[PDB]
Design an enzyme around this catalytic site. Structure first.
Site, PDB file in Angstrom:
ATOM      1  N   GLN A  19       0.732  -1.034   0.039  1.00  0.00           N
ATOM      2  CA  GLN A  19       0.050  -0.037  -0.215  1.00  0.00           C
ATOM      3  C   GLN A  19       0.907   1.207   0.117  1.00  0.00           C
ATOM      4  OE1 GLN A  19      -1.563  -1.242   4.012  1.00  0.00           O
ATOM      5  NE2 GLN A  19      -1.383   1.241   4.389  1.00  0.00           N
ATOM      6  N   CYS A  25      -4.958   0.743   3.827  1.00  0.00           N
ATOM      7  CA  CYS A  25      -5.038  -0.772   4.093  1.00  0.00           C
ATOM      8  C   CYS A  25      -6.500  -1.299   4.253  1.00  0.00           C
ATOM      9  CB  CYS A  25      -4.519  -1.140   5.577  1.00  0.00           C
ATOM     10  SG  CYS A  25      -5.373   0.036   6.950  1.00  0.00           S
ATOM     11  N   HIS A 159      -5.195  -0.947  11.588  1.00  0.00           N
ATOM     12  CA  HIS A 159      -4.592  -1.441  10.375  1.00  0.00           C
ATOM     13  C   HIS A 159      -5.374  -2.611  10.079  1.00  0.00           C
ATOM     14  CE1 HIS A 159      -1.928  -2.134   7.307  1.00  0.00           C
ATOM     15  NE2 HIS A 159      -1.482  -3.272   7.830  1.00  0.00           N
ATOM     16  N   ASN A 175      -0.787  -9.144   4.724  1.00  0.00           N
ATOM     17  CA  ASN A 175      -0.484  -7.693   5.018  1.00  0.00           C
ATOM     18  C   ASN A 175      -0.305  -6.909   3.671  1.00  0.00           C
ATOM     19  OD1 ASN A 175      -0.175  -5.351   6.475  1.00  0.00           O
ATOM     20  ND2 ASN A 175       1.754  -5.844   7.309  1.00  0.00           N
TER      21      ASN A 175
END
Ligand SMILES: *[C@@H](C(=O)O)[C@H](O)C(=O)N[C@@H](CC(C)C)C(=O)NCCCCNC(N)=[NH2+]
Length: 212
Positions: A19, A25, A159, A175
């Protein structure tokens, strides 16, 4: 549900994305779950547009953060374009979903995992990738290189990431920090600690798209 789930092995997970500096996110997390449910339902793994959600989710705040639930509700209400049609720019721009032709995929809704409930989240991961949130601000998480992550971390979630599998001790997390972070972009986070919050608040707010 089985002792191990790994949607990467089912061909339901696209390559790890990065990102960048943008607080997007929530859109990456949502997109992981859309790519997964489309593969699960149709047999095809496609990449979809984080940028489209960044630009077009009017409840989110672009690169200043947002809500995975809002993004999934956007894909169910309108749809989402392929990533190659609406590529990631790392900055919020005008919504261009109109200008890129018909949507590539559309879902049918959004369901929330019962929060603070490990088994409910595992059950949802057994069926599909799930959008989850966690506290990523701690250096232990930031510097994570591999292994089953146990913290230290609080439950101050900040997050959005995606749960794409699990094992007896862990939940497998995609992630959006690029392929050089963690286990090729993934983290395995300890489960089974008896903390209702989950390690790093992992059970705080988890959503998945529904597609008939
Ligand atoms: C995620 C990231 O890029 O790391 C990004 O900071 C984000 O979306 N954060 C969320 C919190 C998690 C998804 C739980 C967030 O802060 N959401 C609320 C909206 C953002 C704050 N408000 C405004 N007006 N910017």
């Amino acid at each position: 549900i089985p002792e191990y789930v790994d949607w990467r092995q089912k061909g339901a997970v696209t390559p790890v994305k990065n990102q960048g500096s943008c607080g997007s996110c929530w859109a990456f997390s949502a997109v992981v779950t859309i790519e997964g449910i489309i593969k699960i339902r149709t047999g095809n793994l496609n990449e979809y547009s984080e940028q489209e959600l960044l630009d077009c989710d009017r409840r989110s705040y672009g690169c200043n953060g947002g809500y995975p639930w809002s993004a999934l509700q956007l894909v169910a209400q309108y749809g989402i374009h392929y990533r190659n049609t609406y590529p990631y720019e790392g900055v919020q721009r005008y919504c261009r979903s109109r200008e890129k032709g018909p949507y590539a995929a559309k879902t049918d809704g959004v369901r929330q995992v019962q929060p603070y409930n490990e088994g409910a989240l595992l059950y949802s991961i057994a069926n599909q990738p799930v959008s989850v949130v966690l506290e990523a601000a701690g250096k232990d998480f930031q510097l994570y290189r591999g292994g089953i992550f146990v913290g230290p971390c609080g439950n101050k979630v900040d997050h959005a990431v995606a749960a794409v599998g699990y094992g007896p001790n862990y939940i497998l997390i995609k992630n959006s920090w690029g392929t050089g972070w963690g286990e090729n972009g993934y983290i395995r986070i300890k489960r089974g600690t008896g903390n209702s919050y989950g390690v790093c608040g992992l059970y705080t707010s988890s959503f998945y798209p529904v597609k008939n």
